[PDB]
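Homework-ish question, so no full write-ups if that breaks the rules, but can someone show me the predicted structure for this set?
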Amino acid sequence: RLPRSKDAILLADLVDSCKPGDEIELTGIYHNNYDGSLNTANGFPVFATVILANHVAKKDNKVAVGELTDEDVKMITSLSKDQQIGEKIFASIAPSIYGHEDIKRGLALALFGGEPKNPGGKHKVRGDI
Amino acid sequence: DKMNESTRSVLHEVMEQQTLSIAKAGIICQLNARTSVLAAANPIESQWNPKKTTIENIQLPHTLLSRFDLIFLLLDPQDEAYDRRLAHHLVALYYQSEEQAEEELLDMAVLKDYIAYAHSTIMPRLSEEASQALIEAYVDMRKIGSSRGMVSAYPRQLESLIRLAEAHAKVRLSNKVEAIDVEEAKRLHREALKQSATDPRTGIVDISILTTGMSATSRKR
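A: Not a homework solution, just the prediction itself:
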């Protein structure tokens, strides 16, 4: 079936909260107003509608560094003190898969990733794995 | 013969399921199509090739050719008697006049009315001798497979014979299909297979309809 759609208005700081292709989660006021173009298109007193936005989240970016709390940072930095943190992270990738420890290790290294750099300001090399 | 692959697939769907499904532009529906397909297929080249069987000449899939109840060959013999009779018939067509036209239109009118009436009121149903004759026909044409260990028939042939017998009973307005109809169905069906499924090296063989490349062709490998 064809999908339905709605227009939404972002104001002030909510602009640039999303881009095309973003699976957003939008809170807003469902607002309606008279529209003569829709009236002549439908032949009835049909009112256009738009969502006056009040919050935009994303359903893939469920966590972000701009939302991390001091307690989250504290427990993260406490976990890093453990000498088993590498093994814990490797065991934590796809825990419902038995074995494949080398695969989990490689995927952890790719998931965290290296550091991009540009020595001399003239020669780029990627950081991603 | 020269319908494109999408048309071949949708026609296969229509002939097998008697429906046409469409999911085009938000519309999602399954239209009914209980249509009787009557077809005219040319050889791929300009002439018929007696070195090859129907499926290899016309280049249609067996998935479509096995859905047909009857397949007929319309090529003319090379006999001078046939040519002379055809020429006399065509001369008679040239000399067709008002009396022949009125006779033909009378035949056409009564034929249309007869077919419509038979559709409207006749509903054939199986007699015991019809059931025995159909089972006997299928078992007999399967008994040919004792030679060479081959398959010589398949149950959709039996269903085709049921359709043809019911049609013949409807022609004579019997309302009960019996052995006269079943023997005519067997005769016409066997003649259709003789025309269509004849490998040039060995004659009629049923596997030509089931798959392309009969045994005389496939035994190259």
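Now go work out the reasoning yourself. Hint: The first strand of chain B starts at residue 19 and ends at 22.
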